[PDB]
Structure formats: structure tokens, C-alpha cells
């Protein structure tokens, strides 16, 4: 798997692929 | 949070698929 | 919407998104 | 321009429907 | 074509297009 | 290699198809 920072849609991407049927939730914040 | 954990630090898998349904 | 800057690739998709139908006009000059 | 608004700088949706058609 | 650091999936999507038929080898070692 | 030539670097597209097959 990914040894990184995941930041932006890349992040989201990454939400998207690993939760799958699940889905997820994205929030934000600081 | 989602973006501390992974974005301002790296994160792993199962870090990841806490943030899930 | 997006609170951020838009860099590469990311800019050329938000740039297809927001215009639609009417396109766009990508020019990365400095 | 697209780049020193929407890149360098903090743009919005407006700034970037002025770069449409 | 291109004048940057392409980095990460931005990196691998480069390879994707220009290789084509043939495709690639990534392998992201330091 | 690939991430230091294209990533640390600016690379090309000949340098880019360098590491096709
Ligand atoms: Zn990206």
C-alpha cells in the first residue's frame, strides 16, 4: 500500500477505493 | 482527523478504512 | 466549492466541471 | 492570470467560470 | 509536451498515455 | 531512476518513454 501523504481528490480517490461497498464520509476539517 | 492522519502525516490501510461506513 | 489552490491536471478538471457545455480555454502561461 | 489566480493565488467558482466559453 | 515534476498517480497516468500498447514498468525506488 | 529523473527533476517525453517496454 501507499506510503504517502494523501491530500485532495487523491485522498478521496484513495477513500473510494479502499472502503468500496462501505463508501465514506469526507470531511475536511482542520 | 482525515486530514491530519492522512494528509499532514502518512498514513497506512487500516487508517484509512476507519474512516469508512 | 473549493477553498484551495488549483495546480496541473487538477486545474484542467475543475476547469471541465464548472464550465460544461461552453469548454474552456487552458493557457498555463506564467 | 489562470495560473497566478487559480494556482499561486485562492480563486473561487466565479473566477473559474471567467475562464470558460 | 510537459515541462514539470510529474509526481505520484500524475506520474504513473504519464506513462499510461505515452507508452501506450507497450506499457510500463513503475517502480517508485528512491 | 524514474522518480528522480520525472519527479525530483523535469524530465521529457523521450525520457518518460525510456522506461516503457
Ligand atoms: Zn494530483
Same mark, same amino acid.
Not at chain 1, 4 to 27: M, N, P
Not at chain 2, 1 to 21: F, P
Given at each position: 500500500?501507499?506510503? !504517502?501523504? =494523501? @491530500?485532495?481528490?487523491? #485522498?478521496?480517490?484513495? =477513500?473510494? #477505493?479502499? @472502503?468500496? *461497498? ?9 | 482527523?482525515?486530514?491530519? !492522519?492522512?494528509?499532514? +502525516?502518512? @498514513? +497506512? #490501510?487500516?487508517? #484509512? *478504512?476507519?474512516?469508512?461506513?
Amino acid at each position: 500500500f501507499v506510503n !504517502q501523504h =494523501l @491530500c485532495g481528490s487523491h #485522498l478521496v480517490e484513495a =477513500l473510494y #477505493l479502499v @472502503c468500496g *461497498e462501505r463508501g465514506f464520509f469526507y470531511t475536511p476539517k482542520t | 482527523g482525515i486530514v491530519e !492522519q492522512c494528509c499532514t +502525516s502518512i @498514513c +497506512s #490501510l487500516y487508517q #484509512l *478504512e476507519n474512516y469508512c461506513n
